[PDB]
């Protein structure tokens, strides 16, 4: 069974700034046969259902702004938002789909304003 852990548990940033959050797996998610990482990132706006943003750790889902960038390989992963917009407010999760499927604890993104 693969265990996933995310940091920070939460953070705050103002509109326009870049943001990075990380994900860790107890086992390597890098698939031999194709050199792809079996990891995904989901975004969940509050009160809504989650949305697939990135799969294969770096492949962006169609209809996903270029602002979202997935990085990392093996056991360490990161999700980056290259200029936060007001509506990027949500909880981010990472999921491994290498063996079974397991979600991390998620990271909450808040927006700074007076």
């Amino acid at each position: 069974d693969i265990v996933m852990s995310q940091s920070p548990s939460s953070l705050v940033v103002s509109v326009g700034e870049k943001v990075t959050m990380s994900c860790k797996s107890s086992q390597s998610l890098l698939y031999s046969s194709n050199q792809k990482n079996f990891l995904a990132w989901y975004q969940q706006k509050p009160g809504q259902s989650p949305k697939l943003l990135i799969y294969w750790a770096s492949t962006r889902e169609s209809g996903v702004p270029d602002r979202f960038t997935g990085s990392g390989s093996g056991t360490d992963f990161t999700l980056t938002i290259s200029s936060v917009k007001a509506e990027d407010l949500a909880v981010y999760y990472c999921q491994q789909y290498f063996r079974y499927r397991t979600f991390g604890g998620g990271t909450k993104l808040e927006i700074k304003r007076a």
Binding site: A40, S49, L52, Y55, E61, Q95, R101
Partner: peptide
């Protein structure tokens, strides 16, 4: 939630 997953191609697409 029940969510679809297109296994060999994508992770949970459609919730």
């Amino acid at each position: 939630y029940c969510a679809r997953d297109p296994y060999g191609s994508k992770p949970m697409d459609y919730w």
